[PDB]
């Protein structure tokens, strides 16, 4: 069993915690954040988006008891003090957003952990791995990044299209759920003015973490794709809208056949495929990081097409954080 | 002064009514719908999206008195019984969505009106007109269509871009506000299954003919553009996301200059231009049918760009319906 | 096993269907609505509020196969043509909202059913039953009504409070989720003008008969309670705010104990009790029809208190419809 | 003209700024906050709730030019350094939420201002004044509080009811719009756990600033009223639901007559009165701090009644802040 410590109990930390409960190969043994244990128990037990925790949560002597198992709770601001070794932690899910470089994240290894997975794109050259794009390029590094939710949707789709038909160039939009960095009513956001406008009232243009990044996990596409985002008033689930010009001519039916084949074979559990009349709530809780929507897409011609793929930006990403933890521990 | 009768007091009929109050060249003299006058007065007086009516509304003996002017209220299901000549109606704003062919709309002319403007795309070969695209092709026809809100956004922008740089091909997405045909919670929508899903909970993919319809008002672009829509949980204002390949290479600065020049000249009051950090609510009440958002767009290279343009799908369209009424009356 | 036919596949019909899958004593064998089987299958399979159906749904030759069981699909507008006897239906869940009198609902019995449960308050003197208030008064009638979601919340709480402390008088407000009769943007609602205003934009005052209806299922309280509703922009879950004057003085701790004792005993599974910091989404999917929120309530003094109780207006009501079906079949 | 400085450019500061533009007796001459002038100009120009600023906003040499008038912009954290005297400031609108005691707010007077109005309830015994409740008790104090939005709605209504019929006891609920202290998705709120839950997803029980406070501005009601709040997913406008037991019997028509009389006479411009089918958006922009909704209320009997009153929690309060500034300067 891989013993895992979570640093940061925000949305990603908490959904990683829930996803880990369904996995026999990974056990969460410790959580660190600036929250009392009883407040941590409350945030785990009740979730507006995902419902009640499936299990029991109790607080005893300042720690969590989840499904009868004790979880060490700490509130260290400095990761070097986390004493991960005392709880036998193998891998740290680094989920605070505060330690996205090798120098800061490596303090976890001085605190006794063996490896670190950052739950966002690195701010230095820490390598990023995205399942269904480049997990097979992993080569023993002890600190890695799972990139971002949107990158986990875009890159597996882009890889299948590129490998089969050749992407000459592409532009993408993500119609993206509201996140925790937005504001409930117009308020201060001095480094991103649009992002301070009231989230439930507005469609909000925004820049995307995936524009800088598919090129890093799929170097053959570097320079060939960029894009942007629109934040809209839903609480979870987002959708990629990818417009590509293709080298090899392909009818929409041939594109569908290729995506379906990857979803049913090599990329099973990463890329999904549907022909149903789905909407965003149909993916709330979805584990696949990229669900191709066959009926939503449209081709102008055999070399110019708009492809649509869904992702639960909380659940898919969180599940793939756990996949990366397992992958780097094999 | 052109005397106008409104058939249908839904969103477009009521916003056309409000817009007409601010115009001296057009006077609403009659409204027809299956609603009592006192309910019509209530719908006019209070608007969740646009606020309280700017003026006085009185009900007197089953008719309306708005800003001191008497407005004849009728409730005919068959437009041939409307007796438009008895109030001197010149043009009918046909806003029920029910009479979108020449045979049905022509009943208004049998009822004594001289011309009909359909407030939606025609379902037969009735000619469509979009200001800033093809008002100048109008040739005296007595029944016309103002196309759709989305077409009114896309076509003026597409024209400026094509005229300056040559559109090889393009695909568009409109991120679109919730409309009256949607449902508050999952409910029956048997000819558009996704469209019945709860509007406030979902991002909802939807078909749009608007990009192709651009081919009808801009024949030089016929076959060169198509697209789709995502309905999202905002009550008004939508945004077009246009991905185009260009024949002539152009820097983003050159695209900005071309759009600004059109917004300040030939297309003034139709196409707008901003470099501010705007969000959708900043266009609630906007009269321009296409406001180019310079900072939101992105160029991958000199021949492949994503352009962003806002529209108030109620206010802009409604104002251009009145513009078409005045144009065909010259 | 009681065989049940559902007339009407709206929110309540579909949630009653889902709830029945989890019960061994009741089996749905037929559904009637003016919807094709494949559209019914789609509405069952995907739910914006409650997620994907837990099981398999197949359409075969115009009928449904759900979890391997065949379900007869019909589309009769007249319930007298329903031939309920041909599938052995014992009880009809009458969920169209259209047959709320003895004369209309009795057509199901002419069609071969033995008993009818209306999933809303009757419009004539058809008896109403609310679990935890008056199931024990049921006297073999062949047509009954399960009252309304709000009545199912208020009556069990009102009974515990009255039985223990004596309600002199009370007024209630339900802060109520958006429902299917509302509109996505301001639209026609000619018998309830406020109710046509855009549901996601507004707090909407609304009349409720539910508090008076408590007088029908709790005659000792007849004339002692009334109230109203505010519709707000959430898709599910509502909350009752009950302001009562008490005959016997009682501290808030004593009210808590009385409610907890009922929730743990006589009213187990109907009335619930929590002291957690809950919000509405924590009851999405709740089966109890009245969850008392101990921390939210407030006492001004020992005889004047404001009590707060949650209900999932879809799930709780739907489950108690099945409870009434089983009760009248004993 | 009263020269006014605003400390704090949050929602209240910005709407006070807009309301002051429509008043000839008050001129804003300076704003202090930790925001650059160009960002302040952006927040003034665009508002998701209230639309575009009615006027011109320019930035010149680090200060604002609003409708041609220069506004001194500063970013002092310590009010004692604000040098209000250099701009001739008479009264400070103290709108940061950080200086709600005499000792902290008085630093404005050492910085050269003559008087201070706190735009929230004081945390010490700084006297509170609410128009239509106790403005006439003002007796020359140089630091005062305008209490809170909900208190400005509740107290004028309570005064009219008490003066005419005698409130024996009452309990209130405010169904309250989302505010800036809430979170867009479930996030940390360690001193108010429910308040951290996602605001657009939830009905959120909350405590009220008006429960501690009508008793302070109407001492005759101290101990006789308390209440709580439900936060719901609307961006602005709230409603008070007041359940009172009355000393003198009064029919609902007599209560209506009394409220209407106050709204048309002594309390004109503070208390409003309507019999229309209004919803919350009908008061977005409303200046009255308490608009009685005659049709929404309900009487159980002549001594036990539920009264409903609307308030724009941004605009009404902000206008009355300006009224208090004028009042203490007379
Ligand atoms: O595309 P990659 O390198 O992540 O490969 C991972 C696939 O799951 C192989 O089964
Ligand atoms: O609509 P267009 O482009 O033909 O031009 C409109 C004219 O400038 C004024 O009607
Ligand atoms: O509904 P009541 O209160 O008569 O009681 C219900 C019984 O306990 C079980 O049906
Ligand atoms: O009720 P008060 O003391 O605020 O009196 C203020 C009224 O506006 C008097 O006209
Ligand atoms: Na596990
Ligand atoms: Na530390
Ligand atoms: Na006019
Ligand atoms: Na069953
Ligand atoms: Na002024
Ligand atoms: Na300072």
Residues A223 and A114 in one domain: no
Neighbours of C211 (CB within 10 A): 28
Residues C221 and C89 in one domain: no
Instruction: Please say whether the beta carbons of C14 and C3 come within 8 A.
Output: no
CATH label of the domain that carries residue B302: 3.30.360.10
DSSP annotation string for A293-323: ETTT-EEEETTEEEEEEEE-TTHHHHHHHHH
Residues B230 and B210 in one domain: yes
CA of B284 to the centre of ligand 1 (A): 46
Strands of the C26-32 sheet, one edge to the other: C57-60, C63-66, C69-74, C26-32, C2-7, C91-94, C115-118, C143-145
Take residue A79 and report the two structure tokens written for it.
């990761």
- Residue C88: φ, ψ to 5°: 70, 30
Resolution of the determined structure in angstroms stands at 2.1
Catalytic residue among C28, C29, C37, C149: C149
Residues D255 and D318 in one domain: no
Residues B244 and B320 in one domain: no
Closest-CA residue of D relative to B285 is: D51
CA of D261 to the centre of ligand 4 (A): 14
Residues A160 and A301 in one domain: yes
> Within its chain, how far is the Cα of B278 from the centroid?
21
**CB under 6 Å to ligand 4: residues?**
D 131-136, 266
Q: Which structural domain, as residue segments, surrounds residue B128?
A: 1-147+314-330
- Residue D192: φ, ψ to 5°: -160, 85
Instruction: Please say whether the beta carbons of D53 and D45 come within 8 A.
Output: yes
b/e map of C275-291 (b: 16 or more CB within 10 Å)?
Answer: eebbbbbbbbbbbbbbb
DSSP annotation string for C285-298: T--SSEEEETTT-E
Q: For residue D41, what are the contacts with CB-CB under 8 A and spacing of at least 6?
A: D57, D58, D59, D64
The CA distances from residue B57 to A210, B18, B64, in Å, are 53, 12, 7
The angle that helices D37-45 and D11-21 make with each other, rounded to 10 degrees, is 70
Q: How many CB pairs under 8 A join A and C?
A: 32
CA of C21 to the centre of ligand 8 (A): 4
* Beta pairing partners, C273: C292
Cα–Cα–Cα angle for C95, C101, C107, nearest 5°? 75
Q: Give which of B147, B135, B94 is closest to B316, Cα–Cα.
A: B147
Instruction: Please say whether the beta carbons of A267 and A160 come within 8 A.
Output: yes
CA distance C240 to chain B (A): 21
In D121-243, which ranges are continuous DSSP H helix? 149-165, 214-217
Q: How many CB pairs under 8 A join A and B?
A: 130
Residues B156 and B274 in one domain: yes
Q: For residue B230, what are the contacts with CB-CB under 8 A and spacing of at least 6?
A: A175, A239, A241, B173, B174, B175, B176, B203, B204, B205, B206
Instruction: Report the distance separating Cα D137 and Cα B317, nearest Å.
Output: 54
Residues A22 and A78 in one domain: yes
Mutate to test the pocket of ligand 2, among B127, B128, B132 (most ligand atoms within 8 A of CB): B132
Instruction: Please say whether the beta carbons of D180 and A185 come within 8 A.
Output: yes
**Strand A57-60 to A91-94 pairing:** unpaired
CA distance A190 to chain D (A): 7
Instruction: Please say whether the beta carbons of D97 and D9 come within 8 A.
Output: no
In chain C, which ranges are continuous DSSP H helix? 11-21, 37-45, 102-105, 107-110, 149-165, 210-217, 252-264, 315-329
Instruction: Report the distance separating Cα C32 and Cα C14, nearest Å.
Output: 11
Q: Please tell me the total count of domains within chain D.
A: 2
Please tell me if residue D314 touches chain C, with a CB cutoff of 8 Å: no
Please tell me if residue D203 touches chain A, with a CB cutoff of 8 Å: no
Instruction: Please say whether the beta carbons of B157 and B130 come within 8 A.
Output: no
Instruction: Report the distance separating Cα B11 and Cα C187, nearest Å.
Output: 8
Residues B327 and B287 in one domain: no
Instruction: Report the distance separating Cα D30 and Cα D45, nearest Å.
Output: 17
Instruction: Report the distance separating Cα A55 and Cα B289, nearest Å.
Output: 53
| DSSP conformation class of B183 | B
Closest residue to A226, CB basis, from B169, B238, B298:
B298
The structure was resolved experimentally with X-ray
Instruction: Report the distance separating Cα B329 and Cα B16, nearest Å.
Output: 17
Is A288 among the residues known to form the active site? no
Q: Give which of B253, B266, B328 is closest to B294, Cα–Cα.
A: B253
| DSSP conformation class of C182 | S
Residue whose pair of structure tokens reads 């630091």 in the numeric block? D143
Residues C73 and C130 in one domain: yes
The angle that helices D252-264 and D149-165 make with each other, rounded to 10 degrees, is 120
Residues C4 and C140 in one domain: yes
CA of C23 to the centre of ligand 8 (A): 4
Closest residue to C285, CB basis, from A49, A51, A278:
A51
| Chain C contact partners (≥3 CB pairs within 8 A) | A, B, D
Closest-CA residue of A relative to D198 is: A48
Instruction: Report the distance separating Cα D267 and Cα D259, nearest Å.
Output: 9
Contact assignment for C285 to A42 by CB distance below 8 Å: no
Q: For residue D64, what are the contacts with CB-CB under 8 A and spacing of at least 6?
A: D31, D37, D40, D41, D44, D57, D58, D70, D71, D73
Mutate to test the interface with B, among A171, A176, A225, A308 (most CBs of B within 10 A): A171
Instruction: Report the distance separating Cα B126 and Cα B145, nearest Å.
Output: 7
* Beta pairing partners, B35: none
Phi-psi map region of A122: left, alpha, beta (phi>0 left; psi -120 to 50 alpha): beta
Mutate to test the pocket of ligand 3, among C134, C136, C157, C162 (most ligand atoms within 8 A of CB): C136
Take residue A264 and report the two structure tokens written for it.
């049913």
Contact assignment for B46 to D284 by CB distance below 8 Å: no
CA distance B45 to chain C (A): 12
Instruction: Identify how many contiguous H helices and E strands chain D contains and give both numbers.
Output: 8, 16
Please tell me if residue D279 touches chain B, with a CB cutoff of 8 Å: yes
Report the SS3 class of residue B13.
helix
In sign, the C-alpha dihedral spanning D78, D79, D80, D83 is: positive
Count of alpha carbons within 13 angstroms of residue D208, beta-carbon side:
32
Instruction: Please say whether the beta carbons of C314 and C18 come within 8 A.
Output: no
**Nearest ligand for residue B29 CA:** 7
Q: What's C201-235 look like in SS3?
A: HCCEEEECCHHHHHHHHCHHHCCCEEEEEEEECCC
Indicate the burial class of A140 (C-beta count within 10 angstroms; 0-12, 13-18, 19 or more).
exposed
| DSSP conformation class of C177 | E
Smallest CA separation from ligand 2 atom 10, residue: B135
| DSSP conformation class of A142 | S
Instruction: Report the distance separating Cα D149 and Cα C58, nearest Å.
Output: 55
Q: For residue A86, what are the contacts with CB-CB under 8 A and spacing of at least 6?
A: A112
Q: Give which of D94, D80, D137, D123 is closest to D325, Cα–Cα.
A: D94
Residue whose pair of structure tokens reads 């001519």 in the numeric block? A249
* Chain C residue numbers touching B11 (CB-CB < 8 A): 185-187
Residues B103 and B3 in one domain: yes
The angle that helices A149-165 and A315-329 make with each other, rounded to 10 degrees, is 70
Cα–Cα–Cα angle for D111, D112, D116, nearest 5°? 90
In sign, the C-alpha dihedral spanning B60, B64, B70, B73 is: negative
* Beta pairing partners, D60: D63
Mutate to test the pocket of ligand 1, among A130, A136, A287 (most ligand atoms within 8 A of CB): A136
Residues 142-161 of C with CB under 8 A from A: none
Take residue B64 and report the two structure tokens written for it.
């309306």
**Strand D91-94 to D115-118 pairing:** parallel
Closest-CA residue of C relative to B10 is: C187
Please tell me if residue A280 touches chain B, with a CB cutoff of 8 Å: yes
| Chain A contact partners (≥3 CB pairs within 8 A) | B, C, D
Count of alpha carbons within 13 angstroms of residue D85, beta-carbon side:
7
Closest residue to B234, CB basis, from A233, A238, A281:
A233
Q: Give which of D271, D198, D181 is closest to C234, Cα–Cα.
A: D198
User: Counting atoms of ligand 4 from 1, which one is nearest the CA of D129?
Assistant: 4
**Nearest ligand for residue A78 CA:** 6
């Amino acid at each position: 069993t891989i013993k895992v410590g979570i640093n940061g109990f925000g949305r990603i930390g908490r959904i990683v915690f829930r996803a880990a409960q369904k996995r026999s190969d990974i056990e969460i043994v410790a959580i660190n954040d600036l929250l009392d244990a009883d407040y941590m128990a409350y945030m785990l037990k009740y979730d507006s988006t995902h419902g009640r925790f499936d299990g029991t949560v109790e607080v005893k002597d300042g720690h969590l008891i989840v499904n009868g198992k004790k979880i060490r709770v700490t509130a260290e601001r400095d990761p070097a003090n986390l004493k991960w070794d005392e709880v036998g932690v193998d891998v740290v899910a680094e989920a605070t957003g505060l330690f996205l470089t090798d120098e800061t994240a490596r303090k976890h290894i001085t605190a006794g952990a063996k490896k670190v997975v950052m739950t966002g794109p690195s701010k230095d050259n820490t390598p990023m791995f995205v399942k269904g794009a480049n997990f097979d390029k992993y080569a023993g590094q002890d600190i890695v990044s799972n990139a971002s939710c949107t990158t986990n949707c875009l890159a597996p789709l882009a890889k299948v299209i590129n490998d089969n038909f050749g992407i000459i160039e592409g532009l993408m939009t993500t119609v993206h759920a509201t996140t925790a960095t937005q504001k409930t009513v117009d308020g201060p956001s001095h480094k991103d003015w649009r992002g301070g406008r009231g989230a439930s009232q507005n469609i909000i243009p925004s820049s995307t973490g995936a524009a800088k990044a598919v090129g890093k996990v799929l170097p053959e596409l570097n320079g060939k794709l960029t894009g942007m985002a629109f934040r809209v008033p839903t609480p979870n689930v987002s959708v990629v809208d990818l417009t590509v010009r293709l080298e090899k001519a392909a009818t929409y039916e041939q594109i569908k056949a290729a995506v379906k084949a990857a979803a049913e074979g090599e990329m099973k559990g990463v890329l999904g495929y549907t022909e149903d009349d789905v909407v965003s709530t149909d993916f709330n809780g979805e584990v696949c990081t990229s669900v191709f929507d066959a009926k939503a897409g449209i081709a102008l011609n055999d070399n110019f097409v708009k492809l649509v793929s869904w992702y639960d930006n909380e659940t898919g990403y969180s599940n793939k954080v756990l996949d990366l933890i397992a992958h780097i521990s094999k």
